Structure formats: C-alpha cells, structure tokens
Amino acid sequence: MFAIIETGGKQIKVEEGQEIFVEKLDVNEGDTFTFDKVLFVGGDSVKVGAPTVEGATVTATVNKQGRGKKITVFTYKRRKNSKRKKGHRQPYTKLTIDKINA
Amino acid sequence: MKLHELKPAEGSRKERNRVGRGVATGNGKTSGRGHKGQKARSGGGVRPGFEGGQLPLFRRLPKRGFTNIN
Ligand SMILES: [Mg+2]
Ligand SMILES: [Mn+2]
Ligand SMILES: [Mn+2]
Ligand SMILES: [Mn+2]
Ligand SMILES: [Mn+2]
Ligand SMILES: [Mn+2]
Ligand SMILES: [Mn+2]
Ligand SMILES: [Mn+2]
Ligand SMILES: [Mn+2]
Numbered sequence: 001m002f003a004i005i006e007t008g009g010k011q012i013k014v015e016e017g018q019e020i021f022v023e024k025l026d027v028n029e030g031d032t033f034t035f036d037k038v039l040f041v042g043g044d045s046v047k048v049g050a051p052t053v054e055g056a057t058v059t060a061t062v063n064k065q066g067r068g069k070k071i072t073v074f075t076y077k078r079r080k081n082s083k084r085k086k087g088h089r090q091p092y093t094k095l096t097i098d099k100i101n102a
Numbered sequence: 103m104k105l106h107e108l109k110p111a112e113g114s115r116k117e118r119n120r121v122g123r124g125v126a127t128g129n130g131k132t133s134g135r136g137h138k139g140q141k142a143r144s145g146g147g148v149r150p151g152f153e154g155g156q157l158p159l160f161r162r163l164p165k166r167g168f169t170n171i172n
Binding site for chain 1: 126
C-alpha cells in the first residue's frame with residue numbers, strides 16, 4: 001500500500017518505513033510533517049483522486065535538514081576570453097514515512 | 103588608535119589597479135587592441151593630421167599691475 005504525494009516542485013511515491021528526500025521543508029528537525037497533497041493511493045484498496053484524493057494525510061517524521069554534495073558549476077566560452085565558476089550545494093530534508101492515510 | 107588596531111579614515115585609500123595579472127580581473131590584453139596600444143604608445147601629444155591648435159596670433163606685454171583691496 002503506497003501513495004503518491006505532491007511535495008517538492010514534484011511528485012513522490014511513498015510506501016512508509018521508507019526514508020524520503022524532499023525539498024527543504026521549513027520545519028523542525030524532530031517534528032512530524034503531514035503531507036497535504038496526495039494524488040493517488042495504491043494497495044489492495046485504491047483511491048485515485050482528481051487533483052487530491054480528499055482527506056488522506058501521508059505522515060512522516062523529520063530526520064535531517066541537510067545540504068547535498070557540492071557540485072561546482074564551471075563554464076566557459078572557448079577562445080573568447082571568459083570562464084565562470086560557482087559552487088553549489090542544495091538544501092534538503094530527509095523524512096521517514098509512518099502511517100500513510102493514517 | 104592602539105597601533106595594533108589602526109583604522110585609516112573612511113573613504114580615504116583604495117587599492118591600486120593592477121593590470122595584466124589575469125583575465126577574471128578584467129584586464130589581460132591590459133588595454134587597447136591591435137593599434138598603438140603598443141609600448142612606445144605616442145598619441146602625438148595633442149594632434150590629428152590638420153593642426154588646429156594653431157590659427158592666428160595676437161600679443162604684446164609691458165611692465166605694470168597693482169594689488170586690489172575692495
Ligand atoms: Mg600659432
Ligand atoms: Mn522557506
Ligand atoms: Mn580592486
Ligand atoms: Mn572585459
Ligand atoms: Mn595581441
Ligand atoms: Mn586601438
Ligand atoms: Mn598600452
Ligand atoms: Mn619600446
Ligand atoms: Mn607633434
């Protein structure tokens with residue numbers, strides 16, 4: 001029994017007991033988040049929403065509020081004299097699911 | 103002012119430009135391109151090819167001159 005939740009700029013498929021990694025969630029490092037936008041839920045019984053299967057909160061606990069590996073954005077125009085380098089590390093949130101639709 | 107905490111007056115002093123040290127700096131041709139941005143570099147001093155720093159002349163001078171108190 002899984003479920004699909006809108007949550008980043010993107011949708012996510014979550015089965016619970018399953019660590020997930022979504023966009024920095026602007027909530028605390030121990031609090032339990034409840035995802036509001038659930039599209040579809042699978043399993044033996046199956047709700048398939050319009051946008052939103054009405055009701056139905058997926059719940060997860062916040063584990064880390066982190067920043068991913070740096071990746072250096074380097075770029076250059078050949079010959080015509082002009083490179084540009086910038087490091088980047090994206091913020092995230094690792095949660096872990098518990099009781100989808102519960 | 104405690105000699106290990108010297109602080110120069112606000113807005114006085116600004117780091118000199120150093121041309122020719124890199125490219126990101128914005129100065130590696132240094133400046134100019136192709137022309138007389140050669141080392142000798144003589145523009146000429148003030149001129150084109152037609153001398154307009156000269157048209158005609160009017161002059162003379164003898165001893166004189168005072169000092170004004172209003
Ligand atoms: Mg003359
Ligand atoms: Mn925010
Ligand atoms: Mn400078
Ligand atoms: Mn330039
Ligand atoms: Mn050249
Ligand atoms: Mn030139
Ligand atoms: Mn020059
Ligand atoms: Mn020379
Ligand atoms: Mn001359």
